[PDB]
Ligand binder design. Structure first.
Ligand SMILES: Nc1ncnc2c1ncn2[C@@H]1O[C@H](COP(=O)(O)OP(=O)(O)O)[C@@H](O)[C@H]1O
Ligand SMILES: Nc1ncnc2c1ncn2[C@@H]1O[C@H](COP(=O)(O)OP(=O)(O)O)[C@@H](O)[C@H]1O
Ligand SMILES: [Mg+2]
Ligand SMILES: [Mg+2]
Ligand SMILES: [Mg+2]
Ligand SMILES: [Mg+2]
Ligand SMILES: [Mg+2]
Ligand SMILES: [Mg+2]
Ligand code: NA
Ligand code: NA
Lengths: 342, 353
C-alpha cells in the first residue's frame, strides 16, 4: 500500500482513526467477568465459542463474534486480519468449516468522504478473500458512523458432534503447543513510531502483518488428526491471559506451566525498554490474530509440529507442560525467549 | 423514571456518551449499497433483513442478523431492553418466532469513570437479558471493548424448518400494508435531549410543553422496548405475503427496500402515517433536520410493515389490538415496477399516549 498510489495524501495513516494503547483496547479480564455476572455437550459464556445443542438432528450451533480497530496502515491486509480474528475462535474449537459470516464495520466521522470511498472497498476486499480461503462467505452485517474505524464480524457453524472438540480434556503430562510467535502489539506500536534500527522495525511489522493474516484453519484440523485434548486462541488478554482462562475450564485437576516464549525477533528488547508499557515478558501483552495454544499428548506433539511445518507450512513450538494442579496457569520465573527471525 | 442521584452526578446522562443527529448515525443507504457491490431451497443473502442459508442437513437453513446502536434514552435498563428488541426485530421480519441463541455487542466509553461503569453497565446488561428472556432466548457470548462512545448491539440466530419463516417476496396487487407501531422516535428522543439545551428549547418551546415531551418520550421508550414477536406469529396465521421492519432508514427507505425484493411486478403506495402525538409539529419547527413527513426519519426498534391479503389484514389488526397494541393500514400494493412512494399530501394520524 502506497497511499499516494490511491490519490490519497502522503500524511494519511489508517491508524490515525483510533488510539494506540500498550495494554490494548479491550475491557480488562477481571472487570468483564464481573459485569458479565447477571448472565450433548453445551458451553456458555467464558470460552472461545458457545455450543448450543439444537432441537434438530442432535446438531449443535457453534458461533462467535469479534471486533477491533486499525493496527496496521495497509487497508487490504487489515480486513484480512479482521476476518481471520473472527474465525480464530471457531478454530480453537477445532471446527474447520464455517457455514456463515456476518461483517461489522464502523466508518470514522473524521475521515473525508473521499478517504472513506477509497479505503473502505479495499478493506471489504480483504475480508472477502479471507472468507473465501475459509470456504465461506459474508451474507449480512451492520455499518455505522463512529469516532473510530471499527472492523469485526460473526462466524457460525451448525455441527454434528464429531466436528468440534470440547476445550477441557487435558491430563497431567500433556504438553503445550503454540502455532504463532508472540509480540504483535509491540511490532504494530513501534512501526507507527517511525534499541532497534529502522530496518529492524520494517521487517518486524511486515512479519507480524503476515502472521496475523494467516488462518488457524489448518491447525484446527490437525487437532483432530493428532487427538488434541483442549485448545484456545491467543488474542487481546495475551499468552498468559488466555492460558489462565483455558486452565480454569479443565475437567481434571491440572495446572499449566509455560517455559519458553517464541517472540518476533527484537520485540522483546523493545517491550523491555518500555518498562510496563506492554508487559511482553509477564505474558499479558495483548495479541491480535494469534495462533492456537493446544494441549497434546507428548507423542502427538512432535508429529503435529512436523506436519504443520512440512504439510504451505508454518513452524510451531513446544512451550510448556500440563501437570496435576488446581486449574491455574503461570509462566516461569525466568522464561526462555526464542527470537524468531523473519 | 431514571435519576442519576442514587446508584453519580445529578448531571449524569447516558445519551452524552454519543452524538445525536436528526438523520441518525447509519452509513446512508445509498453509500452502503456501493460499498458492498463486491461481496431447490430458497436463499437470501445481502440486502433484506436476514440471511437464509440452506445447510447440507435435513432440510434446515440458517436465519440470522446483527445490529449495533448508541444511547437514545437516559434510562440504562430500558436502553438494554431496546438494544435487544432491535436485534430481534430483524428475525421477526421473516415471520420467525423462535430464537435459538443470542450474542451481545458492548462498548464502554473511555470517558466514563469506573463508578459510572460498574453502576450503569449492569443496568444495560440486565435490560438486554430481560428482553432476551421475554423472547424465550438467552445471551451466551459476545464482545466488550473500549470506545469513545457507549455501544450497544448483538446477534440473533435461528436454525429453521422450511415453514418457520416467510420469504418476503410474494406480494400481489390488492394486498394492503399494515404498520404495527407509530413513527417519530428520532424526534421524541431528540426533544427529551433538547430540554437541557437553552438554545434548542427556546425554539421548540413555541410548539410543545415539558409534560408533552416527558410524555412522548415515555411512550417512545415503551414502543421501542416492545418486541415484534406477536406480529411475527400472526404473519403465519393471516397468510402474510411479505414483511420488513422499520429502523434506521425510515418508513420509506425500508418500504422501497422491500418493494425491490418482490417476485411479482408490484409497487407500494403509502397514503397515511401514524405518528406519536405532536412529533410531526416538532419536525416542522426544525426544517429539513428530520424529514418525518417525507418518510426519511430514523426509527429505532420501529414496527413491522406487512403486505397482507386485502381480505385478511382486518382480522390481523383486530387480533393484534384486541388481544394488545394497535396497528394501522397505511397503504396498498398495486401493479408496478418494484418501487414505493409516499403520496404528496399524506394523511397524518396523531397517535396519543
Ligand atoms: N458490512 C456489511 N457487510 C455485508 N452486508 C452488510 C454490511 N452492513 C450491512 N449489510 C447488509 O445490508 C442490508 C441493509 O442493511 P441495514 O439497513 O442495516 O438493514 P437490516 O438492519 O434490516 O439488516 C442488510 O441485509 C444488512 O445485513
Ligand atoms: N457483552 C457480552 N455479552 C456476553 N458475553 C460476552 C460479552 N463480552 C464478552 N463475552 C464473552 O466473554 C468471554 C471473554 O471475551 P473475549 O476475551 O472477547 O473472548 P474471545 O476472545 O475468546 O472471543 C467470551 O466467551 C465472550 O463470548
Ligand atoms: Mg478466543
Ligand atoms: Mg476472540
Ligand atoms: Mg442493520
Ligand atoms: Mg431490518
Ligand atoms: Mg436491523
Ligand atoms: Mg473476543
Ligand atoms: Na468467543
Ligand atoms: Na439484519
Amino acid at each position: 500500500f502506497n497511499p499516494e498510489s490511491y490519490e490519497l495524501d502522503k500524511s494519511f495513516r489508517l491508524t490515525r482513526f483510533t488510539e494506540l494503547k500498550g495494554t490494548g483496547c479491550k475491557v480488562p479480564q477481571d472487570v468483564l467477568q464481573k459485569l458479565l455476572e447477571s448472565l450433548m455437550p453445551r458451553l456458555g459464556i467464558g470460552m472461545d465459542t458457545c455450543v448450543i445443542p439444537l432441537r434438530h438432528g442432535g446438531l449443535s450451533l457453534v458461533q462467535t463474534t469479534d471486533y477491533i480497530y486499525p493496527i496496521v496502515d495497509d487497508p487490504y491486509m487489515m480486513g484480512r486480519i479482521a476476518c481471520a480474528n473472527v474465525l480464530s475462535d471457531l478454530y480453537a474449537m477445532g471446527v474447520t468449516e464455517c457455514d456463515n459470516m456476518l461483517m461489522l464495520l464502523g466508518v470514522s466521522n473524521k475521515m473525508t468522504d473521499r478517504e472513506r470511498d477509497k479505503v473502505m472497498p479495499l478493506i471489504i476486499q480483504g475480508f472477502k478473500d479471507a472468507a473465501e480461503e475459509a470456504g465461506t462467505s459474508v451474507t449480512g452485517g451492520q455499518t455505522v458512523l463512529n469516532p473510530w474505524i471499527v472492523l469485526g464480524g460473526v462466524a457460525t457453524t451448525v455441527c454434528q458432534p464429531n466436528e468440534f472438540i470440547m476445550p477441557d480434556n487435558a491430563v497431567p503430562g500433556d504438553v503445550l503447543v503454540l502455532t504463532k510467535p508472540l509480540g504483535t502489539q509491540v511490532a504494530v506500536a513501534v512501526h507507527q513510531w517511525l534499541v532497534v534500527t529502522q530496518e529492524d522495525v520494517e521487517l518486524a511489522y511486515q512479519e507480524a502483518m503476515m502472521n496475523m493474516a494467516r488462518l488457524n484453519r489448518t491447525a484446527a484440523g490437525l487437532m483432530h488428526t493428532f487427538n488434541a485434548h483442549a485448545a484456545t486462541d491467543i488474542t487481546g488478554f495475551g499468552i498468559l491471559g488466555h492460558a489462565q482462562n483455558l486452565a480454569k475450564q479443565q475437567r481434571n485437576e491440572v495446572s499449566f506451566v509455560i517455559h519458553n516464549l517464541p517472540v518476533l525477533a527484537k520485540m522483546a528488547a523493545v517491550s523491555k525498554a518500555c518498562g510496563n508499557m506492554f508487559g511482553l515478558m509477564h505474558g499479558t501483552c495483548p495479541e491480535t490474530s494469534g495462533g492456537l495454544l493446544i494441549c497434546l499428548p507428548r507423542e502427538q506433539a512432535a508429529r503435529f509440529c512436523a506436519e504443520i511445518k512440512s504439510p504451505e507450512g508454518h513452524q510451531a513450538w513446544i512451550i510448556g507442560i500440563v501437570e496435576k494442579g488446581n486449574r491455574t496457569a503461570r509462566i516461569i520465573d525466568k522464561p526462555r525467549i526464542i527470537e524468531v527471525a523473519p
